[PDB]
Design a binder for this molecule. Sequence first.
Ligand SMILES: Nc1ncnc2c1ncn2[C@@H]1O[C@H](COP(=O)(O)OP(=O)(O)O)[C@@H](O)[C@H]1O
Lengths: 194, 408, 194, 96
Amino acid sequence: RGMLHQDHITFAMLLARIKLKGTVGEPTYDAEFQHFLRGNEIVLSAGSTPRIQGLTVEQAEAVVRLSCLPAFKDLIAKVQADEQFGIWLDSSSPEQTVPYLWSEETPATPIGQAIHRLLLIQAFRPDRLLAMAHMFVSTNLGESFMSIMEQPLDLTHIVGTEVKPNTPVLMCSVPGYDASGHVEDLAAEQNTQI
Amino acid sequence: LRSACDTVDTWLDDTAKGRQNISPDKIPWSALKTLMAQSIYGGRVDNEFDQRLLNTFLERLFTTRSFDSEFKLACKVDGHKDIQMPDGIRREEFVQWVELLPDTQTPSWLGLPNNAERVLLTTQGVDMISKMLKMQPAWMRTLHTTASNWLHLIPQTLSHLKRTVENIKDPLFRFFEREVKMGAKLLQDVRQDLADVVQVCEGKKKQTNYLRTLINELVKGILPRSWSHYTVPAGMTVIQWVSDFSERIKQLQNISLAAASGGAKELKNIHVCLGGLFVPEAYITATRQYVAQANSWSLEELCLEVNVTTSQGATLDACSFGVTGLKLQGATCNNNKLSLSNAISTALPLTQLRWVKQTNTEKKASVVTLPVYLNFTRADLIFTVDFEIATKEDPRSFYERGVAVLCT
Amino acid sequence: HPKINEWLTLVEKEMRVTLAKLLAESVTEVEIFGKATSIDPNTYITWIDKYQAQLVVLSAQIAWSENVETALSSMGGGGDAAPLHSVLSNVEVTLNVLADSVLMEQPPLRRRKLEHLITELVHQRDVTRSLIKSKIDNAKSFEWLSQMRFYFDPKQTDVLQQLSIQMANAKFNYGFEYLGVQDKLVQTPLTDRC
Amino acid sequence: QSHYDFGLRALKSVLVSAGNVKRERIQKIKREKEERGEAVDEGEIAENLPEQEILIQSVCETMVPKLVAEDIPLLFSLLSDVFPGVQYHRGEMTAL
Ligand SMILES: Nc1ncnc2c1ncn2[C@@H]1O[C@H](COP(=O)(O)OP(=O)(O)O)[C@@H](O)[C@H]1O
């Protein structure tokens, strides 16, 4: 409630990771998350990157970086074998239909599958990363976890119960927005002189 | 929003004196549209094309046709679907319809192309990655090398134009005079400063206050304020400025060399890039003045029509000039006809600007006027061009998608 | 009233009331020049010299507004003819007389009055042309409502409340402050929007 | 130049100066015609009135003093282009 709307996904994803570390039945996923955070820093020579048909130089670079993971060792072979891959790559919302391009010796849980599709989305369609991240949170914390953040803010209950008289209500607005009217309306509704 | 609601309330009470129901035609659509386009929402608008877009939206939404069952609030939201006007007659059903909107929203809801938020979403994702990660002398030699490379890349000579009794009467000469003079002054100043920096980095001349400030700005990659004379995008580094300035000096060198030998004839027939010119709108008005003087007409009765050639180097008429480097945003030009495109930009190879006498005839209801901005910031309006849409397009859709021409 | 403030207040109030009465007389005199086909230059110049510059321009505005209002009311049926041309014609002939008056030597005060009248009648002529071109046939249409309109009510017991200025939503009363001879502005479309 | 301005203020100043110059030219012509013979007519004077010369005189009285040396030929060339034929004879303030 006191954060810019662009930072909601960051805090939600960190909460999802915290809950994931607290799950007895889930792996730690250290390598996949470490790559998701710091894989663009993997140094690779110009000649090491090949030219995969249908993928630009940036997508090819992302693919060859992501191939270092054991589950994506043969990613190039999988993407070249699948000819309808371009249809997904040019889809409006590819994150809803991420294709299975990682090798598993056991059927992974939906959470680990979410990390895998998330890495694939980052490698292939970075513009669709945020949406993918959102779905990741929904797999860890529920689909409604962000739902309250989409509704108009309810000042009544918060200032009536959650706010102590000692704690001031700081109302920080970006330029072009003013919360004075909200407070005046709130005081008018409660019949309280302000 | 409060002002618009107050206007709606006042005009509805004025038109409906307490009557339970009124015909949709009796609703003062013109009053609401004009007040919202001139006073409420049009007051902040200081651009004619923004006002045009606001007028387009207001004339789309605030008509009697909004009260029918078939009205589309938005079209081509995903290329197949469209947003339907709720058929409710009470606040509760409208709020219910709003609460039932799909969670997926694209800029096509706003009339913009779907590829408008690609860069924004990519940057937001990279920023989210950086934020998640975040909470988990040699400078003398480098500056010497950088300044030496800059001096090698930057041209050396730019001679002023030669004023003559009959040369002053030519507006093209009158404008290229300012261009070449300013270019030569900037070239000399920049070369002198760079040579001083090189000599300082060799420990041959003592560093002074001006040299200290210039070096401090150079090592951190900020464009010096003494060099910034023409309009540039705000967030541009010094490498990009050096490259652009070198290109501008080369173009001005070509202009001066052409003007020196031959006179004002090849001066009319020289290819120019508006992005490289320091004041392109002055070039536009100079060509307008040249055509007016050649034909002994007035400027206000001369209108401009643009012809995008399929190739560069085609011959030009006596009232048509050739300009290069123009980029069309959100549309493609084929056979002098515009089609709505899903690409970011399309490079116009060479366009002929031709000045002709006004016929006082209204446009053919299929002609779009497009602004020609100096750069991607769309902060400076150089002039306007006129094209004809494709066989199955809509000028309103052209306005809603922000189609415009960029000089660079 | 030997107190300075008392008789100064009396002077201000009497200035307002005298201006209101003089405006009433000016309107009842200029309604002859309006609603007519031919204007004698001599009597028009006599009327201009008799009354104050602000009152002269105000009376011209009142006469034109009433003429246009009655012409629009006469076309309430939609299919009726167009008397607006006559109103336009009236403006035209008036402007011509004014255009003839400034072409020769005039006293400075009367010259400034003539310039003010020329500016106001040019604006009225433009507005009438716009109304005719748009085929306005209702007095409640916004194309006429959007314009600044003056209404004089001679049967009002209060002289200060006799004149009302309305511009499409707003009801103003003339303040009757003595403005002397101000430098009138050209009523550009930007001025109308302002 | 930093001291150049060609906005609405300069235009309106030029227009007011043009009106004043027209009035003083009318007065001067009237006085000359009264002193030389006896024949004056408002219509004849208005018809034989060089209004373009009046505007040129006002423009050169207001805009020329601010110009730098090289812009004076440019401004006079623009005057010739937009106002062909007309020329500006600067007044001679002998007593001054
Ligand atoms: N509609 C108009 N008609 C006549 N003169 C005008 C008009 N608008 C502006 N001007 C003139 O332009 C000049 C500058 O206007 P000004 O009030 O200084 O604007 P700002 O407050 O933006 O500086 C004024 O001297 C004024 O006489």
